[PDB]
Every structure is written in structure tokens, then in C-alpha cells.
Design a protein around this ligand. Structure first.
Ligand code: MTA
Ligand code: MTA
Ligand code: K
Ligand code: K
Ligand code: MG
Ligand code: MG
Ligand code: MG
Ligand code: MG
Ligand code: NA
Ligand code: NA
Ligand code: NA
Ligand code: NA
Ligand code: NA
Ligand code: NA
Ligand code: NA
Ligand code: NA
Ligand code: NA
Ligand code: NA
Ligand code: NA
Ligand code: NA
Lengths: 380, 380
């Protein structure tokens, strides 16, 4: 009756995540000055280069050089010995205004509540009662392993660590009437960039004793757990020098780690009129509200939009058999309690606030009591 | 007992899809000369620009200018009046060799069958008996609508069409013992770039009569079907000029349209040692083999890897209740019939052949009897 499930996470210095963080630093910089900025900022990172490309229409005056370099500094790439340095990297900017054809179809001369979706697309929300934060254990543990690496890098106790890391956690689960119950950790992978001097045995010992044991409860680890620690054997070249990064290439790390579903839309670098972000956050809010409200133990929500149209085209609820109410009944409860127009979501979730860089590593969900993590009390 | 589900697709000239096609044109060009080329080619597209960035180690001599421009020509961007022209665009190249640290951990001095996975990650395969090609109807119809647009553009019958398009199809389904049965089309969205002269009523009439009716069986369309045709009202600016494109930003369009699950890894621009592609293709092959073999009606397969390790770390089978056999029994059948090491998958699926550009629009699955679409006869 048991099964395995695997999820991964990446660290703040993983090149794709660098791009997500930069794109959201750019968004935040615009929103600090112009809450109605229209932002669609993609970032590319390769050896020695950050390129910004996309579309921004805003009243803000933003120093892209400074914003980009400060984000890279925070991540920890501050010297050529680490493969990348915020002080001496190339920052190239290929930003244009938002297409006027998009603007006229989406938001020009529209009442805010009746703004159209900024694009077509589909989005999902998911929640599971297997953890208090209503997230899958696999992805929670994978994120926490990367956060622990960053902590031990920044506090100087593992000074050989560099910012680029990846983790992967496989958990053995039991099924319980559509809900899932974690039993044990089956396999853990950790790969992290390191300095030229530290040897493999020192790193593997530290990753087990100072990282895994500081994160994963001992009850989940046993003599059969498989550890793949620095499995490549050498990871000195890293960051953008080891692998090109792009915004929106970690969309499963950003969400549910393979659980539930994904509609394909990236989050970072986008203002609220891009329903890829706002409606995914709202769908998480719905799903978590259903689970915390006791209506389900596990639930997947789909919503979809057409460009220029305010109301969603479709809403669907899938409860995995974990409710006494039918999926139709839950859908009616959702429709009576939520208004998923983007110009309403923006108000309910406060999506003009410049908090987005904080979302761009360690997952957008399950953390810090962001507005989409605070369940709505449902009337039914 | 019914529910809605929505999927989308994009056309060959959608800027993200342009990037996928270019990245796979680059891969194919290398593989034509060096079947063992190591390729990780990301493409970015914005107004007037194609940038190649990533890592290639290969014995091939490739003219990137020519390869890129020929791909853009095939797509149809051949004049400034369309927003982009293969003849006069900027092609910038930021390609380096594969990291030697990766190479040593993955494939150097390794027997081909025992090559390590080129990265960690998780991948899913999915199959559903609702169509003969074992794909969801929503995504099949969405792809076919984009293909029809391209056909009518290329044959000159709708000469106002341009290459950038998006479609979205919402289908109303019934559940049947874990399987799904399409009933009717609930909503269709089509947005397509167009010339400055054609009016909105002409376009909307043509999209209904020459596109939708030529693609979607009349039995699925009724007086209640909702049509959002050119919903933005104006789409003259398009392609990279309207929206930046990046490789690997259409991973749900490339796969199952929201159905099943996704592990996050993009396909295009990657050789077979990148399990993001090879193992996803193998997982599709497994899933389709289970459905065509009569063991399931619907199935999701998860596999996962660690960099440098040949065998998958985990394999999981989820059959939605559509088999008399337990998921454990199906997993044993899979393990007895499939060897999911990348250096074996490459042989079974012929993944050194330069056919990848053909996969990079209209979905990687459900078409053209590629090797992963030909079911394996299972022994059990
Ligand atoms: C294998 S390249 C994809 C990702 O894997 C990581 N990576 C890069 N080099 C190595 C390496 N030598 N060993 C393990 N992981 C690596 C980096 O996070 C990179 O973005
Ligand atoms: C809204 S920008 C995201 C995508 O939507 C498409 N698009 C661009 N401009 C428009 C427009 N004016 N109307 C409808 N869709 C558009 C293009 O495929 C683009 O890549
Ligand atoms: K990459
Ligand atoms: K974009
Ligand atoms: Mg990547
Ligand atoms: Mg999208
Ligand atoms: Mg895109
Ligand atoms: Mg990956
Ligand atoms: Na810091
Ligand atoms: Na809970
Ligand atoms: Na336990
Ligand atoms: Na060093
Ligand atoms: Na997921
Ligand atoms: Na909290
Ligand atoms: Na052609
Ligand atoms: Na079938
Ligand atoms: Na019918
Ligand atoms: Na024109
Ligand atoms: Na999908
Ligand atoms: Na065929």
C-alpha cells in the first residue's frame, strides 16, 4: 500500500533561481515607486552576464545596474573565486514598453476590478494536510535542506560552501482514503558548489551530520535510507558559469514539487495583471482554505482565463476522495466565497506590495504567512 | 458527476516556442555531425534578437548564424512588417564548453550503458485511453487548432495571419471508474497575430468557420459553447517584439496540458544524457505501454535521478483506480520490462538521431509514431 514520491529544490545561487530573484527584485523596485507598474521581466544568466529582457511600462525610475548587482550580492556571488561577482559582472538591458496592443485589450480604460486577465492560461492550486503548512513533505524537506546550506555558508561554519545547490528528497508514503501519510525518507540527494580545497569525505560527512541531521527528523531516517551526497564527485565550477540560468525554469520547485499539477506559467518578474502569478496564488489560497476549513484533506484547484476577460473561464475542484462533500458541492462553496477576477485578487492578496523578491527562493507557498497562506473563513 | 478541464497550446511563432525550436535546431545540427555531442542550448528571443546561451561540447562545426536563421525562416518570420525577419535579426552567441566538473561526474571514462544521469531531477509520464494517441483531448484539440492556423497561413487562404498564436480548450468530462470521458467542448480561446488591415469581425468569423469547425468535431460543439476569438481585440504586434521568449517556458504545452504531472525539466536544446528529456520520453513510453497493453486506462509514472548515477532513484506508478492490478503489481511489471538507465534509453529510443526540431512544436507526445509512442509489448 506504500509508494515513493520525489521532489527537488534548489538554492538561492542556482542559476535559474538567481534569475527568478533578479526578476522579482526588478518588479519590487518598480512597485516601490509605481504600484500600477506593468512588469514582465525575464532574466538570463551565464558566465559574467545578467541580461534583462522583456516589457515594462512604469512611472518608476529604476537603476537596473544597482538593483541587479544588489540582488547578486545578497545571494553571495561576490568574487571571481566563486565564479561570479556582482561588482564586475556585465549587466545588459533589453527592456521595452508593454505592447500597446496588450495594454488596450487588458487594462486601458478599465475599472480596476474589471481589468482583464493579462494573458490566457491555466493555473492550479494544491493543499495537503500532511504538514501544518499544508504542503508536501518531500518539497518542504528539500527546501529546508537548501536553506540550511545557505545558513551554514553565511554563518561561516562551512566556509567551503558556495551559493549554488540542489537537493532532492524521496519519501515513502502510505495512502489513507485519498490522503497521504509520510512514513520515512527513502533517498536524499545533495549537490552543492564548493571551494577547490575541501575534500569529498569532509563534504559528505558535513552534509550528513550538519545539514541532513539538522533538518530531517530522525524518525524518518533509518539504516536503509540512501544518501547521494556530492554524487558528481566535484562541483567547483558552479553558478551561471556552470549552467545558464533563465527566469521561470524552476516552476515546480516554486510550487508543489511534482504533487498536484501545474499550468505552465512562471511567477517571477510579473505584476498582478499576469494571472500566471496572481491566479496561482489565489488558487493556493482557495485550496488551503478548503483544507484548513476542514472540507478536504487534500485538494487540487484548476482555474483558467482568456486575455482581456476578467472572470475565469473555468474552475474545477478535485478532492482525491478526501471530503464527504462532492466535488460539485465544493465548487459551489468556492464560487460563493471567492471572486477570482484579477482586479479583485489584487485587493484580497495585496499584490501591489513589493514583497516579491521574498517569494523567489524556497517556494512561493507554505511559508511566512503571505496573504495566500492565510485561509479564508468559508460560509456554506 | 461532470467536471471541466482546460489545456492550452501555442503556435510555432509564439516567442517561447521559437526558442524551443531554435534550441532543438542547434541540437540537431550538432547531432548530425557528432552523435555524442553534449548540448545544453538555451535560446532567448526579444525584438530583433536571438541569443544562444549555454554549454556545448562537440566535434561538430556548426554555423549558428545559418542554423538560427533557417529555423526562423521556417517558422515564417521573414519581413519587418511581421515584426521579425530571419534575414536581418541579430544572432548573438554565448556558448561555452560543458563544465569539466559535470563531464567527469557524468560520462567521462564511463561505459555508455553505465553513463550517469546528467543531472538530478524528477520526471513524469502519462497516458489516457480517452484518445487513440493516448493523450488528453483538451491538449490534442488545442494543438490541432494552432496547426490549422499555420496551415491556413502557409497555404495563403488566410493571408492576414502571422505566426504567433495561442489556443485554449476547456472540455466537460465525465468520470468513469478513474478514467475520463469527454462530453463536449465548453470554451475555446484563440488569439493570433494578424496584419494591420483585417478587421475583427472578419477574423472572428474565419476563426470559427475555417479553424474551429475544421478541427473540432461538431458533436462536441453546441449552442452553449463559449468562444473567445481574438479576445484582446487587437494583436498586430507579436512574436518576440510583443513578448520575450525563452527556451523551456512551455513545458506543460510540451507534455500533457495540465493533466498528469510535471517534474519541471524542459526538453529542448538537450542531448540524451539530460534525463529531463530522455527519462520523460521513457516515462511516456512506459505509461503508453501500460495503457495500450490493457493494464490500465489511465496512468501516471514518476521516475527520478541523481547526477552521476545511472539507475533511477525512484519509480512510482499511479493508475487512478483504472486497473485490476495494484499499483505495486504494475510497478513490478515496469521494473521487469524496462531499463531506465539513460545509456539504455538512448538505445531503445534512438536518442542520438537528429529528430528533435520536429518535437519542439505541437507537443512531444501523441504524434508521428516517435519511438516513445510505439508501445513495448510487456511480459508478465
Ligand atoms: C548539471 S548542471 C544543472 C545544475 O546542476 C548543478 N551543477 C552544476 N555543476 C555541477 C556539478 N559538477 N556537480 C553537481 N551538480 C552540478 C548546478 O545547480 C546547475 O545549475
Ligand atoms: C499577452 S503576451 C503573452 C503571449 O500572448 C500573445 N500575445 C501577444 N500580444 C497579444 C495581443 N495583443 N493579444 C493577444 N495575445 C497576445 C503572444 O503569444 C505572447 O507571447
Ligand atoms: K540550463
Ligand atoms: K515572456
Ligand atoms: Mg535550468
Ligand atoms: Mg503562459
Ligand atoms: Mg512566455
Ligand atoms: Mg532541472
Ligand atoms: Na545575505
Ligand atoms: Na494541516
Ligand atoms: Na514515522
Ligand atoms: Na576555490
Ligand atoms: Na507539482
Ligand atoms: Na508562518
Ligand atoms: Na515552412
Ligand atoms: Na486508446
Ligand atoms: Na459526445
Ligand atoms: Na501589418
Ligand atoms: Na501537465
Ligand atoms: Na502516427
Amino acid at each position: 500500500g506504500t509508494f515513493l514520491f520525489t521532489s527537488e529544490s534548489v538554492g538561492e545561487g542556482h542559476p535559474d533561481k538567481i534569475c527568478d530573484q533578479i526578476s522579482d527584485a526588478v518588479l519590487d523596485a518598480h512597485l516601490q515607486q509605481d504600484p500600477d507598474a506593468k512588469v514582465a521581466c525575464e532574466t538570463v544568466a551565464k558566465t559574467g552576464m545578467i541580461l534583462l529582457a522583456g516589457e515594462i511600462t512604469s512611472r518608476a525610475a529604476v537603476d537596473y545596474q544597482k538593483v541587479v548587482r544588489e540582488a547578486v550580492k545578497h545571494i553571495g556571488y561576490d568574487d571571481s573565486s566563486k565564479g561570479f561577482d556582482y561588482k564586475t559582472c556585465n549587466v545588459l538591458v533589453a527592456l521595452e514598453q508593454q505592447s500597446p496592443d496588450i495594454a488596450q485589450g487588458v487594462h486601458l480604460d478599465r475599472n480596476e476590478e474589471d481589468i482583464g486577465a493579462g494573458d490566457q492560461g491555466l493555473m492550479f492550486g494544491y493543499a495537503t494536510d500532511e504538514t501544518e503548512e499544508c504542503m508536501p513533505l518531500t518539497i518542504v524537506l528539500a527546501h529546508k535542506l537548501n536553506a540550511k546550506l545557505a545558513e551554514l555558508r553565511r554563518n561561516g561554519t562551512l566556509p567551503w560552501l558556495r551559493p549554488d545547490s540542489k537537493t532532492q528528497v524521496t519519501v515513502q508514503y502510505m495512502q489513507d482514503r485519498g490522503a497521504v501519510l509520510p512514513i520515512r525518507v527513502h533517498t536524499i540527494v545533495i549537490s552543492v558548489q564548493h571551494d577547490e580545497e575541501v575534500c569529498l569525505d569532509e563534504m559528505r560527512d558535513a552534509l550528513k551530520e550538519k545539514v541532513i541531521k539538522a533538518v530531517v527528523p530522525a524518525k524518518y531516517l533509518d539504516e536503509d535510507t540512501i544518501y547521494h551526497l556530492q554524487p558528481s564527485g566535484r562541483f567547483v565550477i558552479g553558478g551561471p558559469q556552470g549552467d545558464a540560468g533563465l527566469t521561470g525554469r524552476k516552476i515546480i520547485v516554486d510550487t508543489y514539487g511534482g504533487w498536484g499539477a501545474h499550468g505552465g506559467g512562471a511567477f517571477s518578474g510579473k505584476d498582478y495583471t499576469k494571472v500566471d502569478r496572481s491566479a496561482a496564488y489565489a488558487a493556493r489560497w482557495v485550496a488551503k482554505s478548503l483544507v484548513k476549513g476542514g472540507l478536504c484533506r487534500r485538494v487540487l484547484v484548476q482555474v483558467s482565463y482568456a486575455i482581456g476577460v476578467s472572470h475565469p473561464l473555468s474552475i474545477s475542484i478535485f478532492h482525491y476522495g478526501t471530503s464527504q462533500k462532492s466535488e460539485r458541492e465544493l465548487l459551489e462553496i468556492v464560487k460563493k466565497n471567492f471572486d477570482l477576477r484579477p482586479g479583485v485578487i489584487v485587493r484580497d492578496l495585496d499584490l501591489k506590495k513589493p514583497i516579491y523578491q521574498r517569494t523567489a527562493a524556497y517556494g512561493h507557498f507554505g511559508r511566512d504567512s503571505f496573504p495566500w497562506e492565510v485561509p479564508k473563513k468559508l460560509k456554506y
